Amino acid sequence: QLNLFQRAAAAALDAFEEGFVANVLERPHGLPSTADPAVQIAGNFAPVGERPPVHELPVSGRIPPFIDGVYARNGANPCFDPVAGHHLFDGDGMVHALRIRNGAAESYACRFTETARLRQERAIGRPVFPKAIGELHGHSGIARLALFYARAACGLVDPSAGTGVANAGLVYFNGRLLAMSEDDLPYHVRVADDGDLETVGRYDFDGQLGCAMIAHPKLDPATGELHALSYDVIKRPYLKYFYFRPDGTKSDDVEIPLEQPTMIHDFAITENLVVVPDHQVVFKLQEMLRGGSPVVLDAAKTSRFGVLPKHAADASEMAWVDVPDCFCFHLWNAWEDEATGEVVVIGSCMTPADSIFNESDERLESVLTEIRLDARTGRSTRRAVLPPSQQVNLEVGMVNRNLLGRETRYAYLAVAEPWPKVSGFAKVDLSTGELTKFEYGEGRFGGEPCFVPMDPAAAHPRGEDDGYVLTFVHDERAGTSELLVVNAADMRLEATVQLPSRVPFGFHGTFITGQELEAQAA
Ligand SMILES: [Fe+2]
Ligand SMILES: [O-]
């Protein structure tokens, strides 16, 4: 229960939101297919209510009994159908977890991460927090921001606890499953012993983490250190680098001064150095006082990759290498080529001739690239991994987790091939550029293949590709959703698990070992 003044404020604010902000500022102008929910949400992209744990899911084929863990997958799932204006990325975070051990699928569960934002929107039964891309990047964006801060002025909303949406991927670090938020602190999620998922709360690393960090921090296989970047779009140092030890101890911040505020979705790691991608997509907040998006692509700016020693004391140790006209949203892997002293970076990029309208137009390519950096000389190299015969769109993917920052010959990646739909996944030979596809079959689509390495006793440390791929699939002429189990080495289906409900499309997934799960403690 609110007030009597403020109860009557909220009433009037709602009426204003609808009769003015919506009806005057918004409804008379169309809605780009990139903020239009009928597009963004349509089909299997559409959200799904929580399934509390369902046990002994029906399995065909033979799940290898040695496999023992949880496959967990984050993604966007707007609790309430959004009032106009919404991009696929804007939605509430939801995790799907499937317990696997002894040839069994012990439990499927799916749950929202209980974000300060959702907790408040549940209270009212309505969206109230503005959509970041779909509302705030629009022309009404400023008005929308005012409507919110007006409501917040009447104690009707509280941004004070962060307004992140925790939908952009997961890591398992020092016994905690963390739900990654682009513009907020991580949320701690407890994988429950019954198979369920409970949101512990908003995680700042024991007092240490004060700002928002990027949603792709990298965990070194050897050191157990978790390496992170944070960018602040406002104050002087627009980019920090720091890490955490297994002791959960935080390093001193290494400031990376940049000329302007650069958006940085992802970065990469090597044995001894971090690889930061400084690209052309940039923050010009000015734009928003005009009808414009604050996220601009700066044609003028020169794309580059910084190489910085992991235990650096000062920014002066950073080595900037120009790679003109390259943007990559994700960097699968990077490694130190000892034979050259070069740094090899494997990711997937687009070479933008693009203008202002970022998406309402045509021809979006996204190409698996080998980028070679030679820090001392500053000259670089950029080639497509696949020959122009079997050039195929290869989206979100993974390299063997244990070989992170070391040289890997195989990558596994989404075959986005009726563009945004994923018809399969491919095993890639990053040296030779050969591939084999696993076709999902007619009318069936997925996303991020999760490679699980058969933890050990093969050679001694196993062969690079002695593992398994786990992907959710989704049948059209739709029955339910399955999770396949494919043998990474001979790229062959072995087990097929049916999920009770429907697993909607998602973002980054991860695999927690059984014995990894043991450390949980919360
Ligand atoms: Fe990502
Ligand atoms: O992400």
What amino acid occupies position 233?
V
* 329 touches ligand 2 (CB under 6 Å): no
| Residue 352: how many other CB atoms lie within 10 Å | 18
Residue given tokens 């940039």 in the structure block: 282
Among candidate residues 459, 455, 465, 462, the one with its CA nearest the CA of residue 492: 465
> What is the separation of C-alpha 50 from the centre of its chain, rounded to a whole number of angstroms?
21
The phi and psi torsions of 181 (rounded to 5 degrees) equal: -110, 130
452-473 burial, b if ≥16 CB within 10 A, otherwise e? bbbbeeeeeebebbbbbbbbbb
* 169 touches ligand 2 (CB under 6 Å): yes
Method: X-ray
In the chain, what is the straight-line distance between the N-terminal and C-terminal CA atoms, in Å?
32
Contacts of 457 (CB under 8 A, 6+ apart): none
Strand (E) or helix (H) holding 152: helix 141-153
Contacts of 273 (CB under 8 A, 6+ apart): 307, 308, 309, 310, 336, 343
Q: In what order do the strands lie in the sheet with 94-101?
A: 51-55, 104-112, 94-101, 68-73, 509-513
Q: Give CA–CA dist 69/485, Å, rounded.
A: 13
Helices and strands of the chain, counted as H and E runs: 5, 32
Cα of 266 from ligand 1 centre, angstroms = 6
Contacts of 299 (CB under 8 A, 6+ apart): 280, 352, 354
Contacts of 237 (CB under 8 A, 6+ apart): 255, 256, 257
* 215 touches ligand 2 (CB under 6 Å): yes
Query: By the 8 A CB rule, do 496 and 59 touch?
Result: yes
* 507 touches ligand 2 (CB under 6 Å): yes
Residue 216, annotated as binding a ligand? yes
* 396 touches ligand 2 (CB under 6 Å): no
Cα of 88 from ligand 1 centre, angstroms = 13
Query: By the 8 A CB rule, do 244 and 173 touch?
Result: yes
Residue 474, annotated as binding a ligand? no
Cα of 468 from ligand 1 centre, angstroms = 21
Query: By the 8 A CB rule, do 233 and 285 touch?
Result: yes
Q: And the tokens for 511?
A: 């695999």
Among candidate residues 328, 313, 409, the one with its CA nearest the CA of residue 369: 328
What amino acid occupies position 302?
T
* 231 touches ligand 2 (CB under 6 Å): no
What amino acid occupies position 290?
R
Beta bridge partners of 335: 344
In a 3-state reduction of DSSP, which class is residue 251?
Answer: coil
Query: By the 8 A CB rule, do 191 and 70 touch?
Result: yes
Cα of 481 from ligand 1 centre, angstroms = 23
> What is the separation of C-alpha 363 from the centre of its chain, rounded to a whole number of angstroms?
23
C-alpha count within 13 angstroms, C-beta hemisphere, residue 295: 15
Q: Give CA–CA dist 422/192, Å, rounded.
A: 31
* Resolution of the solved structure (Å): 3.2
Q: Of all protein residues, whose CA lies closest to atom 1 belonging to ligand 2?
A: 168
Burial of residue 390, with CB atoms counted within 10 A of its CB: 0-12 exposed, 13-18 middle, 19 or more buried:
exposed
Pairing of strands 254-255, 240-244: antiparallel
> What is the separation of C-alpha 358 from the centre of its chain, rounded to a whole number of angstroms?
20
What amino acid occupies position 296?
V
* 227 touches ligand 2 (CB under 6 Å): no
Contacts of 377 (CB under 8 A, 6+ apart): none
Query: By the 8 A CB rule, do 417 and 423 touch?
Result: yes
Q: Give CA–CA dist 386/371, Å, rounded.
A: 13
Cα of 27 from ligand 2 centre, angstroms = 31
Beta bridge partners of 467: 453
The phi and psi torsions of 44 (rounded to 5 degrees) equal: -65, 0
The phi and psi torsions of 12 (rounded to 5 degrees) equal: -65, -40
